[PDB]
Amino acid sequence: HHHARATGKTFRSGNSEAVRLPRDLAFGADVELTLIRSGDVLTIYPSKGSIADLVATLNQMPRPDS
Amino acid sequence: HARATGKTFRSGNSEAVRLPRDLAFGADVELTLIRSGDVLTIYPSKGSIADLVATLNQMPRPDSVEIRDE
Amino acid sequence: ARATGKTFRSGNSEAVRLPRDLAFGADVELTLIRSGDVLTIYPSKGSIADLVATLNQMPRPDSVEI
Amino acid sequence: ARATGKTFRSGNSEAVRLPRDLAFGADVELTLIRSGDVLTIYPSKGSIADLVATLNQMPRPDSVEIRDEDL
Amino acid sequence: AYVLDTNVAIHLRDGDPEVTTRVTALNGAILLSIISRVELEGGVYREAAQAGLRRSRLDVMLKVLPVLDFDGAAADEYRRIVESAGYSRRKVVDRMIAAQALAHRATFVTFNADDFRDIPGLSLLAW
Amino acid sequence: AYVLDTNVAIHLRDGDPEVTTRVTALNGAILLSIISRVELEGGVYREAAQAGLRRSRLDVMLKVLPVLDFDGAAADEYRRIVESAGYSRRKVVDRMIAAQALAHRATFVTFNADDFRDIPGLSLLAW
Amino acid sequence: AYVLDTNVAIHLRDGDPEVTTRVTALNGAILLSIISRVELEGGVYREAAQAGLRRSRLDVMLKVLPVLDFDGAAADEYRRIVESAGYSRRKVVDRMIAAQALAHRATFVTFNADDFRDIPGLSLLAW
Amino acid sequence: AYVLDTNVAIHLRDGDPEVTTRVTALNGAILLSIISRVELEGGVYREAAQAGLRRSRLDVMLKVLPVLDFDGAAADEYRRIVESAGYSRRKVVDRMIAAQALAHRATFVTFNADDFRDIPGLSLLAW
């Protein structure tokens, strides 16, 4: 379902540049996304919490070193 | 390098993402898009001869250049 | 160019969409022939029977092969 | 079976009618290949017999490879 | 639908008459796990004199047989297998392929059905 | 559909009577490879004293017959031919034309069927 | 973006301090391969006493991290690795994950960089 | 635009550092004739042990360099070639490639300019 490739070009929507996401690459309107650019590569995924995290996993560590 | 949050929207009832200036690619530049599971990646296509030669140069060379067999 | 598409209906006939790169244009008379599962479409410009009859009525060269 | 005709416009695209004796039927996916003057159309989806027949027309390798993961 | 185990798909690619005759009698969708695709790609060039043939034959298979991407549902299935059967390093790859058969409610076609009897709800066809 | 091998088309251009009759007996679309057209064009000027006649007769053929261009789909089939049968310098052009027949699922009509029996999938009409 | 090798991710799960700090210093997106998730899930149930903890600490990671599925584009890259570097049984799973990094133009982060310097085009961070 | 002759493209595929540097400096579109693509495809499995490497390197070239389909316009240029220069059996393939350059008003890059000096109006870059 969400396993696809596409090609496209930048366009202008309002006073902002935008990019279209064809069906199998889109996320749906109700999902908050994180958008990170590294150099010229843009990575987009649902926002589920930053890496600083979740009490940075102060759960209780297993005894064996990994 | 730069981070943002947001939702998609409908442009021509195709889904689209707004790109702020610090995340934008500039106009008229053609992009590659790949979706795998949770991750969408978007980057400019590398279609110049210099990109091709860079890629070829990163790969092992064959042990000889073939003869053309006219 | 290559493409994939699906049959649709126009009135009392099946039809298939021809994308821009595969299209023939508006005023071109086409021949359509099916053999088994293969449909072949090309501009109507005369039959093989007409062609060979024409050739036989023109003078031939002294010998074959060239 | 043979027909003649011109194209027509449907949903912002050219299209051609396939008369009754040429039609493929409903919901059939088609491959279209245009080369020069010729457009060739045939069903996209092949049976497992189609696959095996294609494989059997091809030379087969001089050995059957061992699955390296099992070793 | 059926999912072909890697060794069955190897034997199909390499023209084993015992497998080619059997696969044609199968009804409905015949699918490959993308894990099996990885294994199949790795074998194309291993006998150099046969690389062109194996490339051609794999390419024809991949034009016809849908290949199942490995996604969250397959991993969920993998988790259920280890919970029920316990972890086994030697069986991870095999269980990834079986997990994708489970995720698509597919009959798994295999040469070694005895090695898959610990996967609950897995449908097996023994060749 | 049928694709004519170049020699069949040559015998048609120059008026071979034991070829003109069998071409009419064909019940299907008859197609010409652009590769054959190139060869036919060359043969027009091979013998200067007969170039006028050959030109007129070839123009009549090109007015009627549809021409298959040599495109990416044909080259894909050519690659597959080489993968299965191995490379052959002498038969490159042969195999390019037969690759067009394969891509357009057409029957290939030739006087030299023996040169084409190593091509998997090719429907052959031997004349 | 960054893709963690499995051992880096295992060192994130079981709370290794010298990696956790290095991972937060990353100023790019941190992606987990579905393949690493499979290996991680199996590791939960390796030793039954740590399973409760490892189950809990993995479930937190999977709540947050975005997962890269293994799809046709990654398999395409895997094929390109074998064509250039040759098949390696030991490095199959590692190459599968690196192939995902390549498809998504991401830096691969690993404790085992030497095993990955035969992959044309791969960006590597050795830790 | 430039059209690379077959031998130039072979030197590109096979990693000749002198050709590769020169090609990098050319301005505008770098193109290949589909006839050259046919020739390049035939060389991939020439040397079995190098097959996977040549496969990968040619596939990378065909992802970037547009390949010109051999069309009616190219055959028209071919006919004008033989009309003015005369028929040559040895140069049919060479002239099909040059005809595509003519049809696109492209400069033809070649090691073999001597064989294309009889083609009127051909822009040539002789290496």
Short mmCIF file of all heavy atoms in Angstrom, two decimals, chain H residues 16-35:
data_model
loop_
_atom_site.label_atom_id
_atom_site.label_comp_id
_atom_site.label_asym_id
_atom_site.label_seq_id
_atom_site.Cartn_x
_atom_site.Cartn_y
_atom_site.Cartn_z
N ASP H 16 36.99 3.62 -18.65
CA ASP H 16 38.18 4.28 -19.20
C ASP H 16 38.29 5.69 -18.62
O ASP H 16 37.42 6.53 -18.90
CB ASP H 16 38.06 4.35 -20.72
CG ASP H 16 39.24 5.02 -21.38
OD1 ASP H 16 40.20 5.46 -20.70
OD2 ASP H 16 39.20 5.11 -22.62
N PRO H 17 39.33 6.00 -17.83
CA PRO H 17 39.36 7.30 -17.15
C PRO H 17 39.53 8.48 -18.10
O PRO H 17 39.15 9.60 -17.74
CB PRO H 17 40.57 7.19 -16.20
CG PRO H 17 40.94 5.74 -16.18
CD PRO H 17 40.51 5.18 -17.51
N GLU H 18 40.11 8.25 -19.28
CA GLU H 18 40.32 9.35 -20.23
C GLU H 18 39.02 9.73 -20.90
O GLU H 18 38.68 10.92 -21.01
CB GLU H 18 41.36 8.96 -21.27
CG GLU H 18 41.56 10.02 -22.34
CD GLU H 18 41.80 9.44 -23.71
OE1 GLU H 18 40.88 8.80 -24.27
OE2 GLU H 18 42.92 9.62 -24.23
N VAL H 19 38.25 8.74 -21.37
CA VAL H 19 36.96 9.03 -21.97
C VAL H 19 36.01 9.61 -20.93
O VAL H 19 35.23 10.53 -21.21
CB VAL H 19 36.37 7.77 -22.61
CG1 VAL H 19 34.87 7.97 -22.91
CG2 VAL H 19 37.12 7.42 -23.87
N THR H 20 36.04 9.06 -19.72
CA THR H 20 35.07 9.46 -18.71
C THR H 20 35.27 10.93 -18.33
O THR H 20 34.29 11.69 -18.22
CB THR H 20 35.19 8.54 -17.49
OG1 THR H 20 34.85 7.21 -17.88
CG2 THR H 20 34.29 8.98 -16.36
N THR H 21 36.52 11.35 -18.18
CA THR H 21 36.83 12.75 -17.92
C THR H 21 36.36 13.64 -19.06
O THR H 21 35.75 14.70 -18.83
CB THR H 21 38.34 12.92 -17.69
OG1 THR H 21 38.73 12.19 -16.51
CG2 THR H 21 38.72 14.39 -17.53
N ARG H 22 36.62 13.24 -20.31
CA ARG H 22 36.24 14.10 -21.45
C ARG H 22 34.73 14.26 -21.54
O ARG H 22 34.24 15.36 -21.79
CB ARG H 22 36.79 13.52 -22.76
CG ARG H 22 38.29 13.54 -22.85
CD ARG H 22 38.79 12.81 -24.07
NE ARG H 22 38.68 13.63 -25.27
CZ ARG H 22 39.45 13.46 -26.34
NH1 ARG H 22 40.37 12.51 -26.34
NH2 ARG H 22 39.31 14.24 -27.39
N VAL H 23 34.00 13.17 -21.37
CA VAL H 23 32.54 13.19 -21.46
C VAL H 23 31.95 14.12 -20.41
O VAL H 23 30.96 14.83 -20.65
CB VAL H 23 32.01 11.75 -21.32
CG1 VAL H 23 30.55 11.71 -20.97
CG2 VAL H 23 32.25 10.97 -22.61
N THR H 24 32.57 14.14 -19.23
CA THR H 24 32.08 14.98 -18.14
C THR H 24 32.09 16.45 -18.53
O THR H 24 31.31 17.24 -17.99
CB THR H 24 32.92 14.71 -16.89
OG1 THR H 24 32.94 13.30 -16.64
CG2 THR H 24 32.34 15.40 -15.68
N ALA H 25 32.95 16.83 -19.47
CA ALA H 25 33.12 18.24 -19.80
C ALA H 25 32.20 18.69 -20.93
O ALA H 25 32.19 19.86 -21.28
CB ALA H 25 34.58 18.52 -20.15
N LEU H 26 31.43 17.78 -21.52
CA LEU H 26 30.56 18.15 -22.62
C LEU H 26 29.33 18.90 -22.10
O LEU H 26 28.78 18.56 -21.05
CB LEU H 26 30.13 16.91 -23.40
CG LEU H 26 31.26 16.07 -24.01
CD1 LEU H 26 30.72 14.86 -24.77
CD2 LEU H 26 32.16 16.91 -24.91
N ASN H 27 28.93 19.92 -22.84
CA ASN H 27 27.75 20.72 -22.51
C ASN H 27 26.51 20.17 -23.21
O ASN H 27 26.58 19.60 -24.30
CB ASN H 27 27.95 22.17 -22.92
CG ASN H 27 28.92 22.89 -22.02
OD1 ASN H 27 29.95 23.40 -22.48
ND2 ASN H 27 28.60 22.95 -20.73
N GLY H 28 25.36 20.37 -22.58
CA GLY H 28 24.10 19.98 -23.17
C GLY H 28 23.88 18.48 -23.12
O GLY H 28 24.69 17.70 -22.62
N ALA H 29 22.74 18.08 -23.68
CA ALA H 29 22.26 16.71 -23.57
C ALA H 29 23.29 15.72 -24.12
O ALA H 29 23.82 15.90 -25.23
CB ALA H 29 20.93 16.58 -24.32
N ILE H 30 23.59 14.68 -23.34
CA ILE H 30 24.37 13.54 -23.82
C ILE H 30 23.40 12.41 -24.13
O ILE H 30 22.68 11.94 -23.23
CB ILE H 30 25.41 13.08 -22.79
CG1 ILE H 30 26.30 14.25 -22.38
CG2 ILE H 30 26.28 11.99 -23.40
CD1 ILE H 30 26.97 14.92 -23.54
N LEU H 31 23.40 11.94 -25.38
CA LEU H 31 22.42 10.96 -25.84
C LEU H 31 23.10 9.71 -26.39
O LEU H 31 24.26 9.74 -26.80
CB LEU H 31 21.54 11.55 -26.92
CG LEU H 31 21.05 12.98 -26.68
CD1 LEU H 31 20.57 13.57 -27.99
CD2 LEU H 31 19.90 12.92 -25.65
N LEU H 32 22.34 8.61 -26.43
CA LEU H 32 22.78 7.37 -27.06
C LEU H 32 21.78 6.96 -28.12
O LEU H 32 20.58 7.08 -27.91
CB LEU H 32 22.88 6.20 -26.04
CG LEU H 32 23.89 6.20 -24.89
CD1 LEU H 32 23.67 4.96 -24.04
CD2 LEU H 32 25.30 6.23 -25.43
N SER H 33 22.28 6.46 -29.24
CA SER H 33 21.40 5.76 -30.17
C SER H 33 20.96 4.41 -29.60
O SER H 33 21.74 3.69 -28.97
CB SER H 33 22.11 5.56 -31.52
OG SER H 33 21.58 4.47 -32.26
N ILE H 34 19.69 4.06 -29.85
CA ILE H 34 19.23 2.73 -29.47
C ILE H 34 20.04 1.65 -30.17
O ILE H 34 20.17 0.53 -29.65
CB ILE H 34 17.71 2.60 -29.73
CG1 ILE H 34 17.14 1.34 -29.08
CG2 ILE H 34 17.43 2.66 -31.25
CD1 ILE H 34 15.92 1.58 -28.26
N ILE H 35 20.59 1.95 -31.37
CA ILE H 35 21.47 0.97 -31.99
C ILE H 35 22.69 0.74 -31.09
O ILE H 35 23.12 -0.40 -30.86
CB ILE H 35 21.87 1.40 -33.41
CG1 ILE H 35 20.64 1.70 -34.28
CG2 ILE H 35 22.72 0.35 -34.06
CD1 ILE H 35 19.61 0.62 -34.29
#
